[PDB]
Amino acid sequence: GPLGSNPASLYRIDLFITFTDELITFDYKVHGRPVLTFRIPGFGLTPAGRMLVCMGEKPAHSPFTSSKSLYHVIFTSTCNSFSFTIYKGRYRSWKKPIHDELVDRGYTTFREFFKAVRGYHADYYKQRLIH
Ligand SMILES: [Br-]
């Protein structure tokens, strides 16, 4: 396959969303460390419900309990493109994302990119425990 990708500029954030009945956790990571973490009271969700939370939508709640599940949301941007991609479980190169979106916008500074990334879940950030 291709020997590599060489984007002239690349900003990336990996958002790990952990679903449990008691808490849902949002971990924004760069270079393997959280740069922002927040948590909301958990609720039951269907698989489509979890994807909608990953998209930043408000899904219907379910009364049913479930076991812990990890979703991996990847934001990347060049100066002229922005990608939004959602995996059930962790990213793998062989794994098909459950949602993949490409925006013809890009970002020239990381601060603007990070602000744009946060906006996807801003309504959940309003619901955070430590407020
Ligand atoms: Br919090």
Author numbering: -4 to 126
Sentences from the paper on this structure:
The 2A protein of Theiler's murine encephalomyelitis virus (TMEV) acts as a switch to stimulate programmed –1 ribosomal frameshifting (PRF) during infection. Secondly, the viral 2A protein is required as a trans-activator of frameshifting in cells and in vitro which permits temporally controlled, variable-efficiency frameshifting related to the amount of 2A protein in the cell during infection. Our previous investigations of protein-stimulated frameshifting in EMCV and TMEV have revealed that the viral 2A protein acts in complex with a stem-loop downstream of the slippery sequence, and that this interaction can be disabled by mutating either a conserved cytosine triplet in the loop or a pair of conserved arginine residues in the protein. Despite highly divergent sequences within cardioviruses, the TMEV 2A protein adopts the second known occurrence of the beta-shell fold.
We crystallised the protein but were unable to solve the structure by molecular replacement using the crystal structure of the closest homologue, EMCV 2A, as a search model. Instead, we obtained experimental phases via bromine derivatisation and determined the structure by single-wavelength anomalous dispersion analysis. The asymmetric unit of the cubic cell contained a single copy of 2A, which was refined to 1.9 Å resolution. Interpretable electron density was visible for 2A residues 1–126, with a short G-4P-3L-2G-1S0 N-terminal extension that resulted from 3C protease cleavage of the GST tag. In the crystalline lattice these residues mediate contacts between symmetry-related molecules, consistent with recombinant 2A forming trimers at high concentrations. Since tag-derived residues mediate the inter-subunit contacts, the 2A trimerisation interface that we observe in crystallo is unlikely to be physiologically relevant. The structure of TMEV 2A reveals a globular β3αβ3α fold, with a similar ‘beta-shell’ architecture to EMCV 2A (Cα backbone RMSD of 2.65 Å over 130 residues). An extensive curved antiparallel six-stranded beta sheet packs against two alpha helices on the concave surface of the sheet, whilst the loops between adjacent beta strands project from the opposite convex face. At physiological pH the protein will thus have a positive electrostatic surface potential across the convex face of the beta sheet, surrounding loops and the N-terminal end of helix α1, suggesting a putative RNA-binding surface. Conversely, in TMEV 2A, the α2 helix continues with a pronounced 90° kink until the end of the protein.
